[PDB]
Structure formats: C-alpha cells, structure tokens
Ligand binder design. Structure first.
Ligand SMILES: CC(C)c1ccc(C[C@@H](C)C(=O)N[C@@H]2O[C@H](CO)[C@@H](O)[C@H](O)[C@H]2O)cc1
Ligand SMILES: CC(C)c1ccc(C[C@@H](C)C(=O)N[C@@H]2O[C@H](CO)[C@@H](O)[C@H](O)[C@H]2O)cc1
Lengths: 807, 807
C-alpha cells in the first residue's frame, strides 16, 4: 500500500502463504477450524524468522572467515520491545506479509498486537542498548550484546483507585519464537569459596557453581543482510533429603529470575551483585574462547572491545585481571595493559544516590579473589596519583576506589575510570559536568580518557515502524536513503514554504491523533477531543524529571478556567505516563496526585472538553510507539543538570512534536540544531541552579510572591483534590515547601509563561506546522547511527560500513 | 536390511533427507560444519515428528465427529522411555530413516543413544501405564493418558564405592521435541480455604490458586494411523517486597517439580497430596469441558470412563462429587450413581505399608470440602453395610473409610472400592488374594465389583524394537501379523523339532549376548565371558523381591568352587540391577552387599572366568531394552503372595530366556501357558507361607540344619566380604536371623537345587533352545493388547478395533 514498506512480489506472497500454512500445521499442530489469533501470530512469527536464519548463519560464518575486531556491549538491560514488525521492516517484507496475510483472510496489524514486549529494561539506559544493537548491525560491525535472560521483565502497571499496582510480567508464558537456546555452550560461574596462596600464585577454591546457559536472539541490520547476535544468559543448577535437595535448585536459578526495577536509589542487595557477576563471568569466558579459537594476549585489545553500560558490569575489570593473572599466568603489568586497552565505560547519571558503592563485606564473602585484585588495583593507582600530585593527601582519599566510613565500600565508578582507556558521558553538557564536578580529579590526572558521545535513537523503530505515514510523505519528496542516513532530512528545509507539504505534515499528525484517540476509548474506555493540543510527558516517574511541575501547570489552567469560565483557551489533552520504582514512595504519591487531578478536572461541567488530564497506564516501548506519533507537545522539563541526556526527547522531535524544556541533557544540542527560535526553552540554566544553591534555596519566597502558586498549595493542603482524605498530599506539600532538591517553584513562573507562548502558536496551524518541519528537518544528528559511528571510530578503533552482504 | 523394519522407498528416502536438512538449518539454526551428534539426533526427531502430526490432527478430528465413549487413564506415573525408535516402528519408517541417514553419512543407532529416557515413573506401575497407552492406540480406542509433567524424573543412579548415589535427572535440559505446550488450555486448581454453607448449598472459598498448564505428547498405534494423546500437567503461579513476591512463585511451581521416588513405604507428605489433587482437579475439569462441548449428566457414564491407576488419583471420586453437587447442583444420589458408573480402580499391591492412609488433619487443612464429602460417602456406605449384615459391628469398623487411632486417617483403597463399579487385581492369584484377605468384607458385600485383569507388555517395544533379530526369524516362518496378534506365536510350536529354527534362535541369542558384552566394556570398562549363562535379576530393590536370596545362591557357588577348584561347573555371569528408594536403608545395604560380593568373586584367580557378579548401574527402560534380549535366565523369586503380577517376567519370556521363579503373581499363569515342565518352579506356595506363619517362622532352624547356609552367615558376620569394616553387614544378618518378613532361608534349599537343574539343562544347548521355543511360542497371552481388550469389554463397555484410519 505504501512505498517504504517494500515490494509485494507475486512469487514472494505465494511463498509466505505456504510457509504460513506449513507452520500452522507442523509447528503449532493446529488447523484453521480451531486456531486462535494467537496461533496466527505465531505462524507468521515463525514464517518471518525463517528468513533470518540463512542470513544469521552466513553473517556469523563471515565473521569467522574475516576475523574482524569484535565489539562486546555488556548491559544488565536490553529494552527490546516487540520484534515481528521490526524484523519485517529490516528485511523489506512488510508489504509482502501484509498482502500474504490479507489473502489468508487475516489482518496483520491485529496479529502484531498479540506479541509481548521483551521488557528486559527499566527505561532510557535499557532502550539505548536496544537502539545501539540495531545501529551496530545496520553499520556492519561485528557486535554482540550480552546480558541476562530475565524470566520476569519490568512489571506490568495497573492503576487501582489511582494507585500503581505491580504485577509480574510473565513474558515467556506462550514461548518466545525469536530466541534459540544453546545448552551446548553452557558455562560455569563461581561464587563464595576462599583464596589459597601457593608457589604457583593464588587459587580460588571451595566455590559454589552456577551454570550459565545462553539463549541467542538475532539482530537484523537495515536491508544489508547482516544479522548479529544478542546472547542472554540463563541460570541453571549443576546436577549434583533427596526431595528437598531437588527443590533447592531454585536458589541458584533465582539469579536470572527477575529484572531489578529500581532506577533511582542504590541498594546493596546480594542477589543484584550476583546478577552483575553472573553476566560478567559467563560473558568473559565466552569472549576468550572465541578469541582463542581463531598464548599471545598482546593482540587481545586489537581483536576485542568491551563496552560497559554504566558500572553495572564493572566487575569485568577485575574478572579479566583474575583470568589473565591467575589462570593464564600473565604478569600483573601486562595483564593490566591488556585490560585498560580492552575496556571502556559509559556514565549515565550524576545523581550521587545512583552510584554503585558496594560494601566490602559483601565482596569479601561472595568474591574474595576480586576484592584482593581491587585492593591491588587501588594501591597501584594511588601510587600514580601520589607521584603526579605530591603531597596532595586530600586528592588521594577523594580518588581512592575504597571509601572509608561506618561501612567501607568500593566505588565502582572509580574502578571503571581506572581500568578503562575511555570514559564518556551521553550528551555534551553531561560530559562537561563529569569533567568539572564529580570526576574532576580523574580528568586532571588523565584528560585524554574523557570523551562525549551524544545519545541517539534508531530511525527504523522510531520513524518508519511507528509512523509510516510520516515516513512516506518524506520519502515522496526526498527518497528513501534518509532511513540509514538521517542527515538527509535537512533537505526538507527547502519545503518549509511548500503549501502541499505543510498540508501533508498536518494531515499525518491529525490521522495519528485520531488513531490514538480511538485506541484510548477501545482499550481504556474514556473519550478525548482530538482537536485539542496533545500535551505529553512520558518517562519513568522521578522527582528530577519534575512531573510535579507539569502538575502545577495543569492546576493553574484549571483555576484560570474556573475564574473566567467564558473566556477562550486553547483546548488541551494533558497526558502523563510512566512507572514508579516499587520502593519509591514519593513517585508513587505523584502518580496518585495525577489521577486525583484528573478526577476533579475531567468531571467539571464548566471545563467541558477544554482540558482533560489522562494518566497513561503501563507505559512501555509498545505504548511509546503509539503515543509519540500522536503528540503535539513534548515535555522535557528536568531541573538543569540532572537529565544526563534523555532519548524520549529525540523520539518526539523526529515525529513532529514541538518541545518545551529546560537547557538540560540533549535538549541543549536539539535547540542548537533546530535554532532556539524553534524550541520552547525556559527556566534556570545549570549556572543559575548553582547560584541558587550557594545562596540557599528557600521555597517559601516563591509561595509568598506568587498568588497563583499559593492558591495551588492551599488547595493541595486543604483537601480540594482528596475530599475524603484531606491530608493525603501533605508529604508532597511538605517536600515542595521544605525539602525540594529539584527546585520546582523556582521554574514555575517562566514555565507557565512559556506554556502561554505554546498556546499562542497552536492557534496558528500553518506557523505551528512550519516550526515542526524545522524540527524534523534538523533531527538527523540524533540518529543512533551517528552515535555508533562515533563510538566505532573514537573508542573501539573499527570502521563502520554500509555495504550489503550477499543474499 | 530386515523385513519387519518396513520399506525404504526411493521417494520416501529422498523426502526424509530434505526434511532432515530443512530442520538442521531452520529449526536448529546450524550447518553441517558445526553440528554435533546431538544436533543430528534432533533434526531426525523433528523429521519423524512431522509424520505424526497429520495423523494426530485427524485422529482427534475423527473423535470429535464420531463422539465415541472416551477412556481416561489417570496415573501419577508414565514410564515412557525413549520415543524416536518407537515412533519409527509404529509408522513403518525405520528402514527408510536408516537408509536416509546412512546416505547423509550418519549412523542412526548412534543418534538413537543420544535421546534421554522419559523416566516419569519408578517401575512396574509406571511402565504398565506406558504399555497400556500403546495398546490402546493400537486397538483404536479413544483414550487419553493424564498425569504430571515432572521436571525431574526418577533419579540417575551412580555407584560410588559400592553405594548408590542419587543425582537429579534433568531430562528436559536440551528440550523435548515430542511434547507440545498448550498454554491456552490452562486451568485453575484450588487448595486450602474453607467451606461456607448457604441457602444455595456449600461453597469452597478463600482458596489459593495454582494454574495447571497442559503439555500434549502423541501416542501412535501400530500401523493403523491412530495417534492418541498423553496430556501431562505443569504447575504455574497466577500473575497476581516486589522482588520476594516474584521469587515466591517457585512455591506453587514445586508441585510438578519432582517425581516422588518412594515405592515401598507410604508417607503422609503434604507435597505428595498436592500432586495427587493437582492431577485430579485439572483432569476432571478437562474431561467435563470435553463432554459439554459435543445439563444432562445422565449420559456422562455412557461417554466417559475413568480408570484409577492405584489409589494415587483416588481423589477423583470426591472431586467428581464436589463438581456435580456444588457446581452443577445435581442431588447427591444422582451424582453418586454417575460417579460409581464412571470410575474403576486397579490395585497393584497387598503389602499393608504400601496402602495410602492420609491423616485427616492434612485433608482438613488442604481440602476441607473433600473431607466433608468423604465423611458423607462413608456414612451412606456404612448404612448399606449395617442393613446387609445387621448387628455386625466389627464389620462396620473394618469397612469404614475412616480409621480411628492415635491419628485418624482415610483409607483410600476403601474409598476407591466404594466409589467404583469395578475393582481389579493384576494377575489371577493376586485377584483371588484380594477377595480372600484384604478386601474380603467388600467382596461379600458386592461380589460383582471384583474382577481380574492379568497384566501384559507391548510386543512393539518389548520384541520388535529391542530384539529385531528375533522378530525377523519369527516373521520368516509365520509372517508379520503376530505383532498385533501375539497369540499367533503358538504356530511356532510346529518348529520345535526344526533344526534350522533351533539354530537361528540360538544364534540370535548369542549375537544379543555379544552385543551386550561389548556394551558393558565400552560404557562401563570391565570384561565378561559371553559363553557363560547370563543369569539376570533386574527390578527395583525390595526385600520382598529377594535379591538377597539370589545373593545367597551366588556365595554358595563361590564356596563350592573354592572347596573343589578343579571340578567342572557351568560358567555364569550373574547380573543384578535396580534402584533403591532413597530412604530405604535395607535396600541400600543390599546394593552394597552385591557390589561387595563382586569385589571378592571377580578378583579370585581360582574362580577365573567361571563366575562373575556384576551390578548393573542405573537400570531404566533403555537399559532393559538392551539386557533383556541378552538374558538366558530370568530371576523371578519373590516370596509367594507378594508380587501382585510382575511384568519384567513377561519381557524375558518373550525374548528367549528361561524363568526360575516361585508360584507368585503372573509366574503362575506363565507356567500354565508354557507347561510346568518348561519352567523352573521352586519354593513355598502361598498355602505353605500361611502354614509357616501360623506356626511361627524361626530362621535359626534353617541355620542349624544347613551347613552351607551357616557358612555363608558366618562369612557375612565375620567380615569376609568387608575386610576393612568387619561388621558392615550386621544389619543384614540380624534381619535374616530374627526379623525376616519374607522368609529367605525357608526357600534356600529348594532354590539351590532348582539352580542345579538349570545348569544341567544349559550343558545341552539343543534341549535348552527347545525349551526356549516352547516359552516364546506360548507367551502370547501376555500381550497388553489382550489385557486392554479385556478392560475395554468387561469394564469400560467399548469395543476394540484393528481397522486403519486413512492416511
Ligand atoms: C539502582 C541504581 C544502580 C540505578 C540508578 C539509576 C538508574 C538509571 C540510569 C542508569 C539511567 O537509566 N540513566 C539514563 O540513561 C539514558 C541513556 O544514556 C539517558 O538518556 C538518561 O538521561 C539517563 O537518566 C539505574 C540503576
Ligand atoms: C509410596 C507408596 C504410595 C507406594 C508403594 C508402592 C508402590 C509401588 C506399586 C504401586 C507398584 O509398582 N506395583 C507393581 O505394579 C505392577 C503393575 O501392576 C505389578 O506388575 C507389580 O507386581 C507391582 O508390585 C508405589 C507407591
């Protein structure tokens, strides 16, 4: 039906139909008279999967013959979403399958909705890893993603009486057709035990053994016939009264059971540390085996790069040393040189409560040999510091990997900097913050280590797949090359005064809004005006992301309507969605507040359909793919200095929403690419936040001088939004008035004023749409293809390639 | 190569080859350069499985159209063994696959050895269920086997220093290609809670819910294109801090984790009771759904038969009542009539420690509604007893389902008799014992309930599959019809004087012995003389089976050799194998004793190769298929009255071994079919055992009057067989001398004398072989096809059929 979705060849359509029927009969063991839609989904999935494996086998064959340098991307999270549609898009099969399924009497979009998300991540860090795998395949790199095959991913969120309820995400219940178990590559991982010293060096003995069993998932590049591998490890007990011993096998297997859903506060939990070591130990053995099967580890850094996605896999550093020193008998200095040249570390946050600092006593018990290696690393590192800055004893204690105090801890970030040849932040302002504040000492010691790599998103999933209409009208004007070369979108600047294009952009958006408005009614039974401005804030719930500031704006609009009901205001649907970490009480209160505001606002006859507040339940990748194409306004309103980058921001920009935000994370580079006049910038800069901290932030001052703000706080305290429990929101008021680390009141006035400028522009459709074109046209820098090309050239030492492999 | 293995059509061989390559590439995601033998096995398994599913789908379709009466065979155990070869045999594909694999450069027999046993049973009861499924499919009955998909089957046995060690049988580790998960048919099962009474009857409330997820395995009949289903239930937690709640899901799922390996002593363990209820509750819901999808339960007994394999699924009785009364609102009397006409019960033992007697307090807590129904059943039953035998108060207490004492218990056998229209034993003498002793009261009340159904074995697995040589030379003379009509083997009586046949029988046996002798050396590195008589005792280790009596004979032979070294004796390899229940201390000592005797005997230069004693490790179905065709002598030496039937006995008879045994279980009918002169019968009959019990068994008497016996006991006590721990076997000596329930010494003299007659015959090959022919020729009655035809006609009310379904 549309051109970007590929050819529907008669031969191809015929072949797909017969393979579909083959799988329905032989794979699913069903016939057309009892098959459910779920069965039809699976028969299609298996049909599409068959087209991967030929390319999968020859890609891996190709890497064996050519032996290029291999990139190993280590992460505890891969937030993959659904695979079926992505795979069709990258193989150019979407229209053929559509035709083929239509001819069998089935609607393919209906079948697409049956697939579970692979929710093996929390948010931005996990989704970044998923975008990166896609870009790495698309750019022909010999790359492997390594992680854990969690049995339960991020919880499903239900809202019950306005409160978040968690329920287990049993995503493997019906099977996963994309994975292939590889039990023949099972590897042992050790825990506990103790260290013996001998003439022949140290030995780690009396250990408990857990098996790591790999499951491989294919990762197709965009129309280049490259298919890379994501290898995820599952935990299994070794095979050595009787009944209880068999039931106690569950204790080993609990390692890979569940994704840890805490994305705000570091907790020293043993089970988490076991997960970290497990993925690291199995991956490194696998890496080494692959390297040997092509004595001399001098060439290891020329054949292997290991990228550490935050500190979560930081134990790769002492594990590589353990293997090289204890098992392969390299001398310390040589092993260290190999380790540093092999490893690189990416930081994804500056909030101090988020840094991993493991208690020594845990490491002592679980990984006694690793603690020894860490102490040794620390001592040799601090000797280099002492020699470069003689007499600076304060620097020595600040830079130590060991932190003293009540409990001693290892700082995993310091470990990563010491053992890596490159350290990067994830947007320019974040990388500067790293150098100027929390890693300043390390930057002064080794300035050459520190780099920037601004994040990106894949334009396959985040434009072609989720917004086919937009991709199509773009392709009409400029062709299809932009999909793997997103800088070509600049060519759209020459259509900013073209009346037909202006009309098509606006129509795509409007169709997206109608489609989403319908979805809301169908799956969640309430109605919205699709002529309103769709004001959208979607991301995990955190105080730093300031969903509360949005809440304050919403109540301001409501109060202004009640004050002058018969005055005209631009109507709005305000949508906020996202999950809260289960232990994070304040985040859970914020969700309740949002639903509570909705309860009042949505049932006020005087408001009518001019203002609606919806909490979008169970935000996840599949829901992002629906709501982001329907958005007019993107809320990116974190306190300056707190959002390392953001990636949702880039998704909205690519899909035709305008952005209101602070000068934080990648927003800065986004406004720079589009021009500041085409972005709704407000609020304190990083410099202003600092000045406010020097002085002391006093929230009472703002309450005293802004009557509209005072009125909101009084409504909150008095029970206006919680009539049956007047004090429900006292924790929120109290935090805002006395304990607000993120200075919500300080940006309130400028935010509200900036929101008025948004409303003004929306009244003039033609000029709104013209500003949108200018955003879409300049969004090219934010392709993860750009990001990965920079990692490849400046960190990994490999050259990307856009050349096809033979089909 | 041989005729019974089917045609190797050029078309067929070509097709198998291409499908083999298809699965290797698309299913296993491998190429010929990295494939292991395990991969080749799987590609063949998937190739063969594809030929099942067409027939599977149309068989189940056929039953839907025709709606015959359905047979539901409920068992906690299905001891299936390997599936690949069985499936080829029943589909007539064995020679085609052999050819096809040979042409690909592979040896099919090598690939067959890679398959894991499905060891979902302990022994005779579990293997009987497996033979029965095969016969039911072969006879065209609409039959389903229902059980539990245990994650761990019967343990693997290792012998370490002569002691049994158990290790977990992780049989699903590499996947199971024969099963199909059916998550869409998942059903809820309830536990705990409490009973509320209302105007509208009883309600069972506040229950914990476990999900039952079915996995279907195909069961092919012999060359009739019928494919029945074995449905095995797996336990899953429902989807409703956070981390711990997710990890606690394992508690629900433990229900289906492990096969209970105790086959000697009843233990009231809650987890076992949960397994019993779980299989029962999910199966009954499934049965009812199937019945409704064709109000009126009057026709339920005309459409449904439920066979209870021992008392293990006895809760089907009160569960069917619960469903009919509480949920469908039938009145008690009508529901009871339906239940009795639907259910039938098979007893598989008379040892009192083996009967299930659950403590009331367990039922009270776990299944409070079921206890109520059981009390009500009991009261109405005992009113019928009182009315038939007025004033017989002693009868009332003997027949009660409730047993009083320290702890009150429910007798599950009494429950089964009360709620079933038929009760059967499993060999004629066993069924008579039921009527005369432990169920005498019940027989006097309802004599029409009591039947016999003598056990059998499937001649597909137990002749064609495991002894192709023998099957072939038989087919040369009499054709192939015998394979599904085993009575035709009688025609072989006319070849008992045929010199060529005599020679072929003896050659098959000899080739089987050489093949097995080789296997021993290869997988278990020690050597045996293949010209010796292979004296074999294989079965679970129990005191009643009297492996100890065999041990006493072996030591007698050894002592006679040492006394007269230069005298001639018929050389023997004595093989004993089997597993012991983990908690059964005496059985574990017997295994140690056997290995200990081996240690002395096998390293005595004076003995040479005239006597060897091997303990066959890890006896299981796949090992049975190897050792039984190689046997000359079958040891079936249980104390008269204790082995309900035996089935191993029948396997040996079919495969050309002579039997030495007591007049116990099916041995009685075997000797009757072959003629007593063609069987080595010795020992007390049931009547003699009784007389001895009246008098009092005093083992000292035998020790005092038999010098050879005294010498053995002295060797045992003094440490002859355990030099470094002289008292190791004091428990054994003490049991034999003072506490022997099974009267080992009482049969010693007659056993030893009977063993001399065996040796005498073996010296005359021609006459040995002539006796063998007479056994094989009369083994037809012991086909499970005969057994199942009798269940069908006399219990289930359905007619078997040998007619093909269309291919
Ligand atoms: C529990 C603790 C160890 C922990 C704290 C915080 C997090 C969340 C961090 C790692 C995260 O997701 N950071 C995000 O990374 C994205 C990809 O670089 C950025 O776009 C985003 O700005 C940043 O917050 C995970 C674990
Ligand atoms: C733990 C207790 C409940 C229990 C005791 C004994 C057993 C073993 C019984 C049930 C068994 O296997 N019996 C065998 O059944 C075979 C098939 O009918 C007979 O051939 C054999 O004689 C009999 O012992 C299982 C569980």
């Amino acid at each position: 039906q549309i051109s970007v979705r590929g050819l529907a060849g008669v031969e191809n359509v015929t072949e797909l139909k017969k393979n579909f029927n083959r799988h329905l009969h032989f794979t699913l063991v069903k016939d057309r008279n009892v098959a459910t839609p779920r069965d039809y989904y699976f028969a299609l999935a298996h049909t599409v999967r068959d087209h991967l494996v030929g390319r999968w086998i020859r890609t891996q064959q190709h890497y064996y013959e050519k032996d290029p340098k291999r990139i190993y991307y280590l992460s505890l999270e891969f937030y993959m979403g659904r695979t079926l549609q992505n795979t069709m898009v990258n193989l150019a099969l979407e229209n053929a399958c559509d035709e083929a399924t239509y001819q069998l009497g089935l609607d393919m979009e209906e079948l697409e909705e049956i697939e579970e998300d692979a929710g093996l991540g929390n948010g931005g860090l996990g989704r970044l890893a998923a975008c990166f795998l896609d870009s790495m395949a698309t750019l022909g790199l010999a790359a492997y993603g390594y992680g854990i095959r969690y049995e339960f991913g991020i919880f499903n969120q239900k809202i019950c009486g306005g409160w978040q309820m968690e329920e287990a995400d049993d995503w493997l219940r019906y099977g996963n057709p994309w994975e292939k178990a590889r039990p023949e590559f099972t590897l042992p991982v050790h825990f506990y035990g103790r260290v013996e010293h001998t003439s022949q060096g140290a030995k780690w003995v009396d250990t408990q053994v857990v098996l790591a069993m790999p499951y491989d998932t294919p990762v197709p590049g965009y129309r280049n016939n490259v298919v890379n591998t994501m290898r995820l490890w599952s935990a299994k007990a070794p095979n050595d009264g009787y009944i209880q011993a068999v039931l106690d096998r569950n204790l080993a297997e609990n390692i890979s059971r569940v994704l840890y859903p805490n994305d705000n506060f570091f907790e020293g939990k043993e089970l988490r540390l076991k997960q970290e070591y497990f993925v690291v130990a199995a991956t490194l053995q696998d890496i080494i085996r692959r390297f040997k099967s092509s004595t001399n580890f001098d060439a290891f850094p020329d054949k292997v790069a290991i990228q550490l996605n935050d500190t979560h896999p930081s134990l790769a550093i002492p594990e590589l040393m353990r293997v090289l020193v204890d098992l392969e008998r390299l001398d310390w200095d040589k092993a260290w040189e190999v380790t540093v040249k092999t490893c690189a570390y990416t930081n994804h946050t500056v909030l101090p409560e988020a840094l991993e600092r493991w208690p020594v006593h845990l490491l002592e018990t679980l990984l006694p040999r690793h603690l020894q290696i860490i102490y040794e690393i620390n001592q040799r590192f601090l000797n280099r510091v002492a020699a470069a800055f003689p007499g600076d004893v304060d620097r020595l204690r600040r830079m130590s990997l060991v932190e003293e105090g009540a409990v001693k801890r290892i700082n995993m970030a310091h470990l990563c900097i010491a053992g890596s040849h490159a350290v990067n932040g994830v947007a320019r302002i974040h990388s500067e913050i790293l150098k100027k504040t929390i890693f300043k000492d390390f930057y002064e010691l080794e300035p050459h280590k520190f780099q920037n790599k601004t994040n990106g998103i894949t334009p396959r999933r985040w434009l072609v797949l989720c917004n086919p209409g937009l991709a199509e009208i773009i392709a009409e004007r400029i062709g299809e090359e932009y999909i793997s070369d997103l800088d070509q979108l600049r060519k759209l600047l020459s259509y900013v005064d073209d009346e037909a294009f202006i009309r098509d952009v606006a129509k795509v958006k409007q169709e997206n809004k109608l489609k989403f408005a319908a979805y809301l009614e169908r799956e969640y039974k309430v109605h919205i005006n699709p002529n309103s401005l769709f004001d959208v804030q979607v991301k995990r719930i955190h105080e730093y992301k300031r969903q509360l500031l949005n809440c304050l704006h919403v109540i301001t609009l409501y109060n202004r309507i009640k004050k002058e009901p018969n005055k005209f205001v631009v109507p709005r649907t305000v949508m906020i969605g996202g999950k809260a970490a289960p232990g994070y009480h304040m985040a859970k209160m914020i969700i309740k507040l949002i639903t509570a505001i909705g309860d009042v606002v949505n049932h006020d006859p005087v408001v009518g359909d001019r203002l609606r507040v919806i909490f979008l339940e169970n935000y996840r990748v599949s829901l992002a793919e629906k709501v982001i194409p329907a958005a007019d306004l993107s809320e990116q309103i974190s306190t300056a200095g707190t959002e390392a980058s953001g990636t949702g921001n880039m998704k909205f920009m690519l899909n035709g929403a305008l952005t209101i935000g602070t000068m934080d994370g990648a927003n800065v580079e986004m406004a720079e690419e589009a021009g500041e006049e085409n972005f709704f910038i407000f609020g304190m800069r990083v410099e202003d936040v600092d000045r406010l901290d020097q002085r002391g932030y006093n929230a009472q001052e703002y309450y005293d001088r802004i009557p509209e703000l005072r009125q909101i706080i009084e409504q909150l305290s008095s029970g206006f939004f919680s009539p049956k429990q007047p004090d429900l929101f006292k924790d929120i008021v109290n935090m805002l008035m006395h304990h607000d680390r993120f200075k919500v009141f300080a940006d309130y006035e400028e935010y509200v004023k900036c929101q008025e400028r948004v409303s003004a522009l929306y009244k003039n459709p033609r000029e709104w749409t013209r500003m949108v074109i200018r955003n879409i046209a300049t969004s090219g820098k934010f392709s993860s293809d750009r990001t990965i090309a920079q990692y490849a050239r400046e960190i990994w030492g490999v050259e990307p390639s856009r050349q096809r492999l033979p089909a």
